Amino acid sequence: MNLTELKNTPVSELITLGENMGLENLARMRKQDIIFAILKQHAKSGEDIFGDGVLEILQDGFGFLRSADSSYLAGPDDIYVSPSQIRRFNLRTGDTISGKIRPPKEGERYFALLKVNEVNFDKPE
């Protein structure tokens, strides 16, 4: 299961998928909140979850992967990328990244990149 796929899924279908995995009251939430709930539930089940986006490294040194159609506009489903991941793979703003992500923990706000699988559609090598 991956974030962009879910983002491209009709809400009624997301509701069904979520219900089938033990979630409730989905209809009343914003689509993005429904998606968060589903990915979190799936990950809690020990299943891998993926995400992708265009990287933008900010001032502090960390970055976020944003949807390509976002033209770099910040959003709640932005995927956090750590300074260590950027250094590990010499990541650059404008780079397209895809990989495993993890749901935010208690107090956490964003989904975070867990493993960089591809950089500019190629092996991180």
Curated annotation (Swiss-Prot):
Residues 61-66, 78-80, 108-110 are annotated as: RNA-binding 1. Coiled coil: none annotated. Residues 48-123 form the Rho RNA-BD domain. Belongs to the Rho family. Homohexamer. The homohexamer assembles into an open ring structure. Facilitates transcription termination by a mechanism that involves Rho binding to the nascent RNA, activation of Rho's RNA-dependent ATPase activity, and release of the mRNA from the DNA template. This is Transcription termination factor Rho. It comes from Escherichia coli O157:H7. The lineage of its organism: Bacteria, Pseudomonadati, Pseudomonadota, Gammaproteobacteria, Enterobacterales. The gene is rho. The chain holds residues 2 to 125 of 419 of the full protein.
